[PDB]
Amino acid sequence: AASEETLAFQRQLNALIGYDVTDVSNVHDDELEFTRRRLVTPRMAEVAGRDPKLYAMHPWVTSKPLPEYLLKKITNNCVFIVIHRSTTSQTIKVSADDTPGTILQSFFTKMANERDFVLRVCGRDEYLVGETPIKNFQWVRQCLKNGEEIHLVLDTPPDPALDEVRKECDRKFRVKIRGIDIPVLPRTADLTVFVEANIQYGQQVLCQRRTSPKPFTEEVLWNVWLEFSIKIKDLPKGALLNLQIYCQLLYYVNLLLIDHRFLLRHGEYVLHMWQLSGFNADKLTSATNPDKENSMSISILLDNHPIALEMPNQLRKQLEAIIATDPLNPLTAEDKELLWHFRYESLKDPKAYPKLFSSVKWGQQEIVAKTYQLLAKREVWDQSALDVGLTMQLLDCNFSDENVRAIAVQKLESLEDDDVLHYLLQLVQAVKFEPYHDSALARFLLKRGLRNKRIGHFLFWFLRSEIAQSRHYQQRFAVILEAYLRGCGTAMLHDFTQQVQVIDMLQKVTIDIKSLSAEKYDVSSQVISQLKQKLENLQNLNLPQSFRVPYDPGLKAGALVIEKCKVMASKKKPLWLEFKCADPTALSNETIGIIFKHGDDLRQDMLILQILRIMESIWETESLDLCLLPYGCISTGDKIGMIEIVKDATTIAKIQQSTVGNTGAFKDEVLSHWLKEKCPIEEKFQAAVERFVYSCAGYCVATFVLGIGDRHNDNIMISETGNLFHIDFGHVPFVLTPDFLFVMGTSGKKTSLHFQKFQDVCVKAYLALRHHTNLLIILFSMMLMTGMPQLTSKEDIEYIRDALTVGKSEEDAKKYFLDQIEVCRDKGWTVQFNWFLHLVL
Template sequence: MGTLCDAQRKVDHWTMSCGKLLEDIREEKQMDGAGRINNEFRFFLSCDINLPVTFRVEALDGEPSPASSNSVLDEWHSVPELYVECSLYIDGVLFGLPTRTRLASVEKPYRWNELITLSAKYRDLTVDAQLALTVWDVSLPRQEVAVGGATLILFNSRKQQLKTGKQKLRLWHGREADGSVPTTTPGKVPKLERGEIERLEKLVNKFERGQLPHMDWLDRLAFKRIEKMKLEESKRTGKTNLHLIVDLRSFEHPVAFQELGTPLPTQTPNFSAGNLDLVTVWDPEVGRQNPSENKQLKLARSVARGVIDRDLKPNSSEKKEIQKILKHPPTRILSGDERQLMWKFRYSLKSDKRALTKFLRCVDWSDAQEAKQALDLMRKWAPIDIADALELLSPVFESEEVRAYAVTVLERADDEEFRCYLLQLVQALRYERSDNSHLTFFLVQRAVQNAELASFLRWYVAVELHPSYARRFYCIYDILEDVLKKTPSGEKQWQNMVRQTELTAQLCSIMRDVKQARGGTKKMIEKLRQLLSGLLSELTYFDKPISLPLDPKIMITGIIPSESSIFKSSLHPLRLTFRTETGGKCQIIFKKGDDMRQDQLVIQMVSLMDRLLKLENLDLKLTPYKVLATAQDEGMVEFIPSTSLAQVLNDHKTIISYFQQYHPDEHGPFGITAACLETFIRSCAGYCVIMYILGVGDRHLDNLLLTKDGRLFHIDFGFILGRDPKPFPPPMKLCKEMVEAMGGAESEHYGRFKSFCCEAYNILRKSSNLILNLFHLMAGANIPDIASDSEKGILKIQEKFRLDLDDEEAVQFFQSLINDSVSALFPQMVEMAHRWAQYWR
């Protein structure tokens, strides 16, 4: 017994003092950098790291005390649903958009284990940059409750070194994380408030990061003792702390804070004998503009303002250079010589509508006299196209007069064209300098004239509402509400929108209840129909018709329980059949727990490209089904009766056999009607081109669907802009079964397919500026594959257009892409592996 007591005392002594001793020794070694450790100068500067800020949200640690009146978790019902909202604050101001994790599972501890990628890069961070992390519970009906929040400062305050590895943050019960400086919700307990438990937690964190030595037998005893001490402390105080565990990104060397463009603090390296390591010396002039060149530029423009030769014309070589500049994509930054050339011949370029955006890019807006001259000239310029007007609404242009001019150009668009750009115009509100901007009132004005546009505007804005970053969106939301309520018809329209919101909230509640049913998908479907026929019978027959959020032209009157079902997938989306006011039916898919905004963007682009192709008399039989995000983790999708290509091949062996069942024609090609084959060929061509341009990844036979009339279309756009979970993906999804359905690689039908592809590619290349500008406006929308690196994503799309080629060269290029896609062997192996995985699943 005495031996055991002595061992216990030794464990306690190690727990209390060993970690502290090692920490002091480590700090002394780091302070002694000149002689031993830091003489190698191996570190990174934060301003040099052009990578997005990433970290992993792992789990929620700890259980709330039932006796605590401040614990929000006491009010949970049996199935809590938690997610973590992650925001980055720089100098107390929100940077970019918050990012949400998925909903946590019901098992405890609540785990997410989700990698979060923010739009900010490490080079953007300041010494006061901090992460604000809030755990929210959405299990309560129609409200989100803050479980607790914590703020993590990314740089060590004393060493100004980037924190890495696992961090255990104490949550402030019932409070949202505060990103102000100084924060009121620090995840690390201040020194003055630290007790023995907090000191031990800090040592445990260091132990988990590998900063303390491991000794298995002693570690087990120590952790057992720590848990016992924590339990005794919670019993004594009657309070249990919740902790959020996050894992920050680690680098090969320490990352020291350094602002972009700031000289490195001078240090005198102490070279030991024989040390021949290279030392990087900071040059403060690197990356800065040449002052003599800036002076020359100002003098040249000053002379031009004094004695202006309005009839000055460029010579032949200057004309060629100007034409080259005008062909630059909107992503291209003009060089100093190019800017000077555009300014010099600005008066001779007034009649060329393509030149205005390039001219405005070369203006020095900090020079009041030059800015005034540019604005006067802008008003006299030849009217520009709507694609160029969208470029003027990007964050590149801050002048309110320039942005107001862009709005006047957009007024020329009819409702159909305006609808194509509405999603991006809402996002452009982020870059306005005032709440009551011309763009805000323009959007409201167009919305009140068209009920369909008003409904979509309201949903696009509602998805972006959040207290910490949505001032512009709250402003337009309030203005739209006020304007609509001033007229009887507008008041009725607004009430209809409110009922749409109530409907989506009820559908979310149904999904939560249905997920509790045990016994698989069958039991869930029974539970769904039971709810619709019993407790929620008011959803089967509405008091008044409601316009369908997905398509406001359709008025729905209730849900048909017997024709509603649930898909067999991890999120268990609902397939709902609604009655319509005209006596018909419409089917939608409702998802909860998935961000639908990326799918919404892709389908919008498919619709736009379909319109551009049809304007050139090329109908490729596309199927741009409707998608609407009703929140950042929920949304609706139009249900198109169809069958996956994998299922078609499994049941019928070939695509032609499938068509023969529904469209037989013994005199037609391959025993089917010519119209059915033509539809299939055209739709294959259209989606091959569009999916290639958008860089859609993760293409397999389960997300290629086929309708009975021959239309092929794609679904599930979780990977775009070149991202793909599969190795070595082909340029486009064109499997051998699709080629065989056209008669093989030597058939005339396959030749027409390639002809349609090349024609569509060249048509869409003509509208490259429009598509690039639309994606540029979406850069701040926090859509996963854009937010990770918006500049890189837009450049990837630009690269797909191959603007360096003429039309003939583009045809040859695209034909080679088709050949590469058909002959690629590795994707066939991956597809086979995917089919086997689906079979065993």
């Protein structure tokens, strides 16, 4: 039995999730339900312990110091803020150390609990509340950087009652391979086929056995016992039995040998397989293919609980040569032995943990034993200061051991909310490397999401993103999302519903509109009146009147402005939508622009954009502001999603087309001429030129390190404020064309004033990233493994190593980047003209 209401609840949950989590149709064990049942406690333990008030106003703060760029603009010890009562308003100087209370307890003495209000950000759902210095608020810091006033408004604190959560042996190992079955055969000359079985741990193969090659029929039997050299008692918790079909790898499937319950896996199994799209997180999944009618299946038998709990010389000082912090530097049998033999000496240094645990022989019970003793005393580690870079490497595909991974997650615990937001996307992707559905990392994410609405809002869209287009991982992520959705609150549950409703309706339009004309780029007037009408059709009584903007939670969107909506003259025929701001206190009339697009895999864009945000914080710790513009983007489904529209900005390519020919030979003057005219007032033009210098640099260094600098002009944009920024990330060192150089004041290839400033920044920016080589290397490799198709592991990943110029000394590095800036100088328009040709051919 089950209370109708409850049943109805779980019904909406699944609607939010985008998948039916109750489904037990696709599970060969009760790990999903078991997990779906185990998270209930940690979730309820979070809801109960959080402060309903601070949770309702989700203050966004940071405990870091104000970088030079920000502090300098405070050479007054204080700062003022315009407070809006009603249509009223008054300025009040305040010191950087004032508390939100000391701000009102003071503001009221100037006019004259009597003070039953709170400070919110005009036209935003952002509150300055709690025992924190106003200088430690994110909003404040951003206003400072963008030299803007801090317009706040007096209003009543939200009611926490809106967030209330609804009511509740010893012999060797062997496996019998019975056979492979598939309904339809792939018309391909008819080849041979054999099954490969691997015992795998942390992406390493411990033992491997094969069957005899037979003709590729539709039912191929073997009934052969494959015996491995490993002994049951030596199978580590978290090992997988990888089953592959070859002839070229065609299909694969995995099965955890030791289950969530610590029991060896016995029984007959019929496992449905994944097909190779043509290394990455997907090949590691324990999920089976749900397409049980069309998929290849393999049948096996398993039949044989256990698991359930002097100071060296120069030699050892060569161990330090190995601990060369090179994440992408493999280890030799010799290297590993050295590391393991001198274990305890290696333990006295955190930066060597990854290398040390990768020298462990996980396939030997007795050794795993000593490892667990080595961890028993985590002094050097527990006392060490957090290093995300080091922590992330311990969460990647190379480590399957729960305790090793648990210490990494232990360090994450130290992260303040603002830091959890910079790495959240990558931590959610790292869940794919966990051997079991329930893990310390799945728990950490659940918790921080339940404790802070901002993180929760994002955890939600990152999880949903994957649930929607990832068969390999959607079950595990749904169970994680459901557990979050049973604790976020009724208010958020409502917000999520309105947002889900809106995108589900807008993408339907996006695609339908795409069919009407996915061939010729001739955007007709009818397709346009068509879009409008469709929008009118929804605007009626279906489309939610208002909703929070998925990539910017504090912004509230209202009615669509049908008059400004259009279909862009782009291959993908993206929709360009504009909405009003639902908030009356909005200190402006500017609309909220959002592009909806079908055709590009926006998950790659989400990953690039977040990396970029991480670089900005790295540069901040060093007091540098490259003016990047990592606009919001959220991947909603397979090749579909939304993009934040950066206001009054244009493509660099379009600029060339307007002045000069839309096909002719690009001109230099073009860009600067466009800027001058865009912002007449000679005082604003100067500043624009200043932005263009730093932003241009920021992107050149950023894109260069990411191996993504060579792109067409059409994928680069500029604001009427001088900000340059790259866009539309689908997948010469970088783009620094004559027109860019021109804006900096440089004809031919000589004179250089602003060019001087340019060079300087690039270097200081480049060498600032090098101080974080290990962090950038695990991020770059995790990105490739979780967001790119079948990659060239370590090969595709060996690029960033050269780009960061590992080993080489700073000065030599400085010169290496300087030469890169030079290769562009000599190339000029050659590359662009070729890209144009390419789009022509």
